[PDB]
């Protein structure tokens, strides 16, 4: 079971671990879906309508 | 403008009103959401400075 799982070390019980061997938990990257227009906003705002909602 | 009015003894307003036009558009998109559009036309509630 060594051979075949544990990473072959120099020392075993090493003081501290590379950051190659320590599992990393890699989640995907988050989309994010922005709800209002930028300038839109701005444009109808200033017109004199009074957004809400 | 300038009224002239008839000088009663108790103090008083005088409410006038100008005709406007105000409406207004409620879009709801999605289950659960409803935004309005309002808008005011000579005497507008919001403006660039608000």
């Given at each position: 079971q060594a051979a075949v799982t544990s990473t072959p070390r120099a020392k075993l019980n090493p003081?501290?671990?590379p950051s190659t061997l320590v599992y990393?938990?890699?989640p995907?990257?988050?989309?994010?879906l922005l709800p209002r227009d930028a300038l839109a906003e701005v444009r109808m705002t200033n017109s004199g309508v009074q957004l809400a909602g | 403008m300038t009224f002239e009015v008839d000088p009663m003894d108790?103090?008083?307003?005088?409410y006038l009103?100008?005709?406007v036009?105000?409406?207004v558009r409620v879009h709801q998109p999605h289950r659960g959401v409803?935004?309005?559009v309002y808008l005011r036309t000579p005497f507008s509630?919001?403006?660039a400075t608000t």
């Open positions: 003081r501290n671990w990393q938990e890699i995907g990257p988050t989309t994010v | 108790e103090p008083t307003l005088l009103l100008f005709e036009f105000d409406v409803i935004e309005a509630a919001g403006n």
